[PDB]
Amino acid sequence: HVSLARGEQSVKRIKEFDPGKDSFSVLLLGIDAQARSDANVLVTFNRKEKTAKMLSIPRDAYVNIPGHGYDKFTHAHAYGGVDLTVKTVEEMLDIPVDYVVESNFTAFEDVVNELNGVKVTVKSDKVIQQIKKDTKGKVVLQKGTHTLDGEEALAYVRTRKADSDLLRGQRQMEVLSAIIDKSKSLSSDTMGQNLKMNLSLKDAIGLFPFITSLKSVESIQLTGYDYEPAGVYYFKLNQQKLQEVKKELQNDLGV
């Protein structure tokens, strides 16, 4: 239960925040343990409409890191940890980031296994083959609809050599929505040191009924083009798509 430097609620919110009645956002960061945040997924929950929209932020996105200038998005966590990542997201999308969850491999695997695996419909032989290479044959997935365990799901959300980081972000949002779906079919705290978030376990349980009864789940994608001036790769964002995304998330959050 880490406390954000910003204080009580997001500085982007104009009115007082009511976590039980207001639409809210959650930033999910996956750490590859010096440790780096290679997974970056923002989920915005529209309370009134009972909808959630997932957005993967390309780790190479060319964005302003407050106090550091334009750089790769993932460098915000490297420079200033979770606090600076939250600030970078709020400036980039001009929306409040209400909650943040930081996870390493172990928390992810334990969560998946606690849910008795997550359902994924694997469809690409190239993805299957690259995961085999990634894991030196420890993880061998099958095409079709199957339940993956923690080790299999982790390799699935990590692979990328067969296909860009944007396809990896789509595999992350795919697995995230499968985790939510599998938590629906549950009965009714050893993850410490592996899962850090800015709210208590109690407050998290309070949101579970709402999160597990959404009418729709959608994925959003920030489009762009490669920007490689001097041997450093950035992903410049399409400013029209960025604005459309900002408007959609602002409207979803009531701002």
Ligand X SMILES: CC(=O)N[C@@H]1[C@H](O[C@H]2[C@H](O)[C@@H](NC(C)=O)[C@@H](OP(=O)(O)OP(=O)(O)OC/C=C(/C)CC/C=C(/C)CC/C=C(/C)CC/C=C(\C)CC/C=C(\C)CCC=C(C)C)O[C@@H]2CO)O[C@H](CO)[C@@H](O)[C@@H]1O
Footprint of ligand X (CB under 6 A): 26, 28-30, 32, 38-39, 41, 43, 101, 103-105, 107-108, 111, 134, 157-161, 168, 172, 175-176, 211
- Is 153 near Cl ion (CB under 5 A)? no
Tell whether residue 124 is a contact of Cl ion (CB under 5 A): yes
Please give the DSSP secondary-structure letter assigned to residue 72: E
Spatial contact of 109 and 194, defined as CB atoms under 8 Å apart: no
- Residue number, 60 or 90, with CB nearest to Mg ion: 60
87 Cβ neighbours under 8 A, 6+ residues apart: 6, 66, 76, 80
How many Å apart are CA 95 and CA 100, to the nearest integer?
A: 14
When the beta carbons of 93 and 139 are compared against Mg ion, the nearer one is 139
Site for Mg ion in 26-85 (CB under 5 A): 32, 36, 38
Give the contacts of 34 (CB within 8 A, at least 6 positions apart): none
Number of residues that bind Cl ion (CB under 5 A): 4
Residue nearer to Mg ion on the CB measure, 10 or 56: 56
Q: Which stretch binds Cl ion (CB under 5 A): 90-98, 121-129, 180-188, 207-215?
A: 121-129
Treating both helix axes as pointing N-terminal to C-terminal, what angle do 150-158 and 165-184 enclose, rounded to 10 degrees?
150
Which bin fits 239, alpha (ψ -120 to 50), beta or left (φ > 0)? Answer: alpha
Contact assessment for residue 98 and residue 252, using Cβ atoms and an 8 Å cutoff = no
- 23 and 36 Cβ atoms separated by less than 8 Å: no
**Residue 123 interacts with Cl ion (CB under 5 A): yes or no:** yes
The verdict on 161 binding Mg ion (CB under 5 A) reads: no
Residue nearest to Mg ion (CB): 32
- 101: partner contacted, choices ligand X, Mg ion, Cl ion, none (Cβ within 5-8 A by kind): ligand X
Which of ligand X, Mg ion, Cl ion, none lies near 87, with the C-beta cut-off 5 to 8 A by kind? none
Query: Which spans of this chain sit near Cl ion (rule: CB under 5 A)?
Result: 122-124, 127
The footprint of Mg ion (CB under 5 A) covers: 32, 36, 38
